Amino acid sequence: SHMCDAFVGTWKLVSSENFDDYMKEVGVGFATRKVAGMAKPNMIISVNGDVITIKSESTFKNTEISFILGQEFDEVTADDRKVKSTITLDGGVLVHVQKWDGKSTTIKRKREDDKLVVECVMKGVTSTRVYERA
Ligand SMILES: CC(C)c1cc(C(C)C)c(S(=O)(=O)O)c(C(C)C)c1
Numbered sequence: 224s225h226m227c228d229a230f231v232g233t234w235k236l237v238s239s240e241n242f243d244d245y246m247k248e249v250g251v252g253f254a255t256r257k258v259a260g261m262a263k264p265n266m267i268i269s270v271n272g273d274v275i276t277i278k279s280e281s282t283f284k285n286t287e288i289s290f291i292l293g294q295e296f297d298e299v300t301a302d303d304r305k306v307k308s309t310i311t312l313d314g315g316v317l318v319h320v321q322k323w324d325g326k327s328t329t330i331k332r333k334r335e336d337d338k339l340v341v342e343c344v345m346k347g348v349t350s351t352r353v354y355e356r357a
């Protein structure tokens with residue numbers, strides 16, 4: 224209990240850096256990269272018992288994942304990859320690993336001051352996305 228209290232709430236994207244390059248490395252095609260890169264999502268995080276729910280809502284897509292820390296799940300990503308995901312808490316950081324087709328990407332979510340900072344890594348390429356409370 225209270226594991227993720229500082230994450231819970233509704234968060235609005237305020238900045239993004241290198242997301243197009245991250246998406247290229249993941250294999251996202253041109254048209255999806257353009258439309259997804261233009262998205263300004265709200266991220267809605269909630270907790271009920273051991274179950275964490277993360278929603279991303281934008282003009283591009285509305286996604287929702289629910290999961291228990293450490294317990295793998297199947298996820299269809301906004302770009303329509305079918306991935307195996309596992310999310311854990313590591314020293315206060317939510318660490319989300321997605322595996323598909325022999326590839327892997329890791330998305331980290333952390334609280335820093337009044338922001339929620341999301342770092343998306345695929346091999347050598349990192350994208351940083353900053354959110355503030357809505
Ligand atoms: C196109 C794929 C790679 C993608 C899309 C999005 C939105 C623009 C729908 C997101 S996120 O939902 O902003 O975190 C993310 C995060 C989870 C890395 C990834």
Ligand SMILES: [Cl-]
Nearest residue numbers: 239240241242
């Ligand atoms: Cl960007």
